[PDB]
Amino acid sequence: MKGILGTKIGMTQIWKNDRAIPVTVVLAGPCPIVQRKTAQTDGYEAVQIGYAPKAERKVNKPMQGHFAKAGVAPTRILREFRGFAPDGDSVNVDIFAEGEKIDATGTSKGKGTQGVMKRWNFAGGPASHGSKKWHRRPGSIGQRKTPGRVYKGKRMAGHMGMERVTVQNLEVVEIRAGENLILVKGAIPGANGGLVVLRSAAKAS
Amino acid sequence: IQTGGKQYRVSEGDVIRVESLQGEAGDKVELKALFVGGEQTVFGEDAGKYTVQAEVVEHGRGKKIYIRKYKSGVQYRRRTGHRQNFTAIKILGI
Amino acid sequence: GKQPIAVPSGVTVNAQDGVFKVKGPKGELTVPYNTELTVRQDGDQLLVERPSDAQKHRALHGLTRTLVANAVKGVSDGYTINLELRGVGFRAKLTGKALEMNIGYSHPVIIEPPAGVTFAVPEPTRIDVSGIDKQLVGQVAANVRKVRKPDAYHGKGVRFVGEQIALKAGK
Amino acid sequence: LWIQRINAGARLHGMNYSTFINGLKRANIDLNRKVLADIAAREPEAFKALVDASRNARQ
Amino acid sequence: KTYIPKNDEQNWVVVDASGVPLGRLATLIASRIRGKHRPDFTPNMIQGDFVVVINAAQVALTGKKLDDKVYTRYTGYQGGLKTETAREALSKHPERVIEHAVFGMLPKGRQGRAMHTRLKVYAGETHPHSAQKPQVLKTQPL
Amino acid sequence: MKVRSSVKKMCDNCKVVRRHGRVLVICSNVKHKQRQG
RNA sequence: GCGAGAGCUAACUUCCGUAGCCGAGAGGGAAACAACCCAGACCAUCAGCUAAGGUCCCUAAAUGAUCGCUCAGUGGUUAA
RNA sequence: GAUGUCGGCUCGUCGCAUCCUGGGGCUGAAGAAGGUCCCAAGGGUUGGGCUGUUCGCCCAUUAAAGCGGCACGCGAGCUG
RNA sequence: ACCGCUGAAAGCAUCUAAGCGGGAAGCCAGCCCCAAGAUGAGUUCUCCCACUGAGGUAAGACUCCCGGAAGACC
Ligand SMILES: [Mg+2]
Ligand SMILES: [Mg+2]
Ligand SMILES: [Mg+2]
Ligand SMILES: [Mg+2]
Ligand SMILES: [Mg+2]
Ligand SMILES: [Mg+2]
Ligand SMILES: [Mg+2]
Ligand SMILES: [Mg+2]
Ligand SMILES: [Mg+2]
Ligand SMILES: [Mg+2]
Ligand SMILES: [Mg+2]
Ligand SMILES: [Mg+2]
Ligand SMILES: [Mg+2]
Ligand SMILES: [Mg+2]
Ligand SMILES: [Mg+2]
Ligand SMILES: [Mg+2]
Ligand SMILES: [Mg+2]
Ligand SMILES: [Mg+2]
Ligand code: NA
Ligand code: NA
Ligand code: NA
Ligand code: NA
Ligand code: NA
Ligand code: NA
Questions:
Q1: In angstroms, what is the span from residue A126 Cα to ligand 15's centroid?
Q2: Domain range for residue B26?
Q3: E44 beta carbon < 7 A from strand G?
Q4: How many CB atoms lie within 10 A of CB A85?
């Protein structure tokens, strides 16, 4: 249900009680509400929400027009949510509590054109027994005269990375209201300064 | 058709099978089977009451068509010229 | 074949269209059947006649007569099944109107009746199922018995009053 | 082609192609057969008359 | 020597399907689409009338709705992902039942698929009528 | 539940009951529960 | 296909006898398909009758008539 | 006028006559552990000694260490 | 698979013909990702607008430059 947008700032050490908890700092800047998607007026229930602030000199006339309807301030990023529909704007306070589990999603770092050993784990071949197919290079791709063809959606070299990724059940260690900061036990995908979306625990234990 | 153009037609010169009698303006009487002469629909047999008169226009020679045959892998290729002859008749009857 | 049908004075039989509606003091009860099968109240009692005399008309005849009889007896006196909790340490409680099963399982078994059926516990080792519709009753009690099938060694669980269960005996 | 038109015509009144042609066989009267399609396509009234004739030369 | 084609014909016919079995309905529709009476009667171009199916959700069958009748919906590479669904299991998308029972009875060429465009199925009573501004000539099966 | 393609009587308590297109046999004796399916 | 041998009364098996077709045979049917069923292509035609086969829709042609069967999706793979 | 042969390695995917987990009936099923049958292919199905081995035997474990198919899958992928 | 309720033909019996319930790592949905070229191409918010006798233009974008936790080139 509820959630917000922020920036991955980094990972650091942090003891809680008597144990060393690795955490990942996230800036959940205040998020304005720019549009209310009513199912009646649209077709589904949702809320549009903005993040990084932009200079009006950089904002398209149309986009300015959009922002004027609610009249907050031009922002660089907009996204939507579900079942979320409160009043005012979207600060992580009251939203997330320390101890609550959360689904943290973002765009991974991408690795470009990675082989199969990297991409799909694979296993490649013997490095000593006399080859020409060391490191990677896959084995075969099919069978033979039967379906003389390779299966749709199979394991080959490709673009690894740049994917939407959602990690589930992360613990909210600490929350600094006013500094608009939040700490999350463990690692979140994507790079520092990356966009992250922190959503309520969807289907949890 | 098969021979002899019946039906209702408003003075038109058509082209059908030859009509033996060579020449021109040879009165050609034909039996009817249907027609809308004066918006009066008349079926067969009864139509025998009315008959079509036509005059021969010219004895034209058909359009040139080459007759080709072929069976693969056995050779057999055949090529021969052909044009089926006719005559034009000017319809002008009851 | 079945004809004699006991129709008292507290019952109301309505053969309107295909939906046959029966009114009574214990509550009204609707019972659907066929349209090709003739059925009405001739004089005092109720007589059910069949079109053909082969099989596709007699089966449904018996069926229908039976069902109707059940509706009547249902709105006249009502149906009630008597169960029994036999075994060691077996018992059942009551919460409002739901039945609380306690029979060897770690956590008690809550069973919530549907709309028209009611439980009763006049004794900690005996279950009473009361209801209007006989079918429903049967099905709910059936669910109660389904919780612990009498084992072929001691015969525990649920049983109908004087059920004859033969113990195989292991040793 | 011609057939495909003829049975359509037939059907526009309450008969079919089988019934219709057959209702011209029973009567040596109508022996059009060829061109009939053109008649059902251009002159509807005429073809109606033919249908009516077919029914009249049947039952 | 026969009759040329036109295009003035464009009747907007609406076929109810409430209670009617899937065959009669299907064949009827497909037939009117291809060419029921056929204007110029030509096979080159599509002269069929436009068919609008209402209800459809209340289509009738025999006894094998839950059984036997299994529409098959298979993927690109069905590597163990050969999707199969019962015909009642099409409460999800009713329009698919009829829609995808008629297309089978229409040619497989270019023009065929062009014809599928004239088929318009709606699951509902008075609602589908809002999708109907042109002719609304309603013609029952039999 | 012994699946036999040849279900026949074995005593005087066996009763053949035709179900949903399947051959089943009821009996007080639970060892006499034969079924083709 | 029939009548035999050989072969496990197997093989699109092999070896003889006999009939037909293919080989050198187009066309219609059997989805596709040498052989099977119907039929032997001189040439032309916006003509008609039939055979084998069929006549809801995808192709032409009665969602034809009367008396039955089968709750099976048999038809639309087999036996004790 | 060429359809590259065994085994391994690599990479897969499918059948179900199911090795393990799942749901059942029956028992010479007290319990625990099993036996047998029926339903069920979602996932999983270890590492080593000898041998070119596929098999197979053995060490040590495992819920289990299933059987087959794909030109006894895979040499314009490797080995030899 | 299997286990039951009401219950005829065998005016007994019966999970069954009408009807209904419970029940598997399987099926469908649920979870993560893609997805309108879903050519039936969908929905919503906002912007510039009613020129000229193919071309000046608005909104807007591209080229070019400097870079990048983006990347073979794009
Ligand atoms: Mg390596
Ligand atoms: Mg190869
Ligand atoms: Mg292929
Ligand atoms: Mg031979
Ligand atoms: Mg030769
Ligand atoms: Mg053919
Ligand atoms: Mg004929
Ligand atoms: Mg015949
Ligand atoms: Mg037809
Ligand atoms: Mg079959
Ligand atoms: Mg070669
Ligand atoms: Mg080669
Ligand atoms: Mg099995
Ligand atoms: Mg045990
Ligand atoms: Mg060695
Ligand atoms: Mg082999
Ligand atoms: Mg090999
Ligand atoms: Mg060697
Ligand atoms: Na010959
Ligand atoms: Na065949
Ligand atoms: Na498997
Ligand atoms: Na091993
Ligand atoms: Na294998
Ligand atoms: Na090479």
A1: 18
A2: 1-94
A3: no
A4: 15
Q: Which fold has domain E1-142?
A: Ribosomal Protein L13p; Chain: A; (3.90.1180)
- A98, A77 Cβ separation under 8 angstroms: no
Question: What single letter denotes the amino acid at residue C17?
Answer: D
Please give the backbone phi and psi of residue E49, each rounded to the nearest 5 degrees, phi first.
-80, 170
Q: CA–C1' span, C146 to I22, in Å?
A: 9
For D4, which of E1, E3, E38 is closest by C-beta distance? Answer: E38
- Numbered residues of chain E with Cβ closer than 8 Å to any chain A Cβ: 76-77, 79
CB atoms E43 and D1 under 8 Å: yes
Q: How many residues does chain B have?
A: 94
Q: What is the enclosing helix (H) or strand (E) of C139? A: helix C134-145
Among C55, C78, C101, which residue terminates a domain? C78
Experimental method: X-ray
A123: nt with nearest C1' to CA: H10
In angstroms, the CA C117 to CA C128 distance is 11
- As a whole number of angstroms, the distance between CA A140 and CA A156 comes to 11
DSSP letter for A90, please: B
- Interface check for A152 against chain E (CB to CB < 8 A): the answer is yes
Task: Of C54, C57, C130, C119, give the one whose Cα is nearest residue C92.
Answer: C119
Evaluate whether B43 touches B84 at the Cβ level (below 8 Å).
no
Instruction: Give the distance, in angstroms, between residue A47 CA and nucleotide I44 C1'.
Output: 12
Report which of E43, E18, E2, E39 is spatially closest to residue E98, judged by C-alpha positions.
Answer: E18
Instruction: Please tell me whether any atom of strand I lies within 7 Å of the Cβ of A10.
Output: no
F32 is in an annotated binding site: yes
Whole-number Å distance between alpha carbons of A107 and A102: 17
Distance CA E77, CA A154 (A): 10
Q: At what angle do helices D44-56 and D2-11 cross, to 10 degrees?
A: 70
Q: How far is CA A153 from CA A113, A123, A164, E10, in A?
A: 17, 19, 19, 45
Query: Number of structural domains, chain C?
Result: 2
Statement to judge: residues C89 and C143 lie in one domain:
yes
C-beta of residue A99 within 8 angstroms of C-beta of residue A16: no
Residue A145 CA and nucleotide H72 C1' are separated, in Å, by 15
Contact status, residue A70 vs residue A90, Cβ threshold 8 Å:
no
The single residue listed with the structure tokens 């690894």 is A160
**B34·D39 Cβ contact <8 A:** yes
Which residues, in sequence order, are CB contacts of A127 under 8 Å at separation 6+?
Answer: A134, A135
Taking Cα atoms as reference points, which of E93, E71, E92, E91 lies closest to residue E82?
Answer: E71
C 46-75: CB within 7 Å of strand I? 55, 58-63, 66-67, 70
Rounded-to-integer distance, Cα A54 and Cα A76, Å? 5
Which helix (H) or strand (E) segment is B28 a member of?
strand B28-31
Does residue A152 lie within 7 Å of nucleic acid chain H, judged by its CB?
Answer: no
CATH code of residue C45 = 3.90.930.12
Ramachandran assignment for A178, one of left (phi > 0), alpha (psi -120 to 50 degrees), beta (any other): left
Cα distance between residue A107 and residue A8, in whole Å: 11
Query: Closest chain A residue to E79 measured between Cα atoms?
Result: A151
Cβ-based neighbour number of residue E134 at 10 Å: 10
**Of the partner residues E1, E3, E37, the one whose CB lies closest to the CB of residue D8:** E37
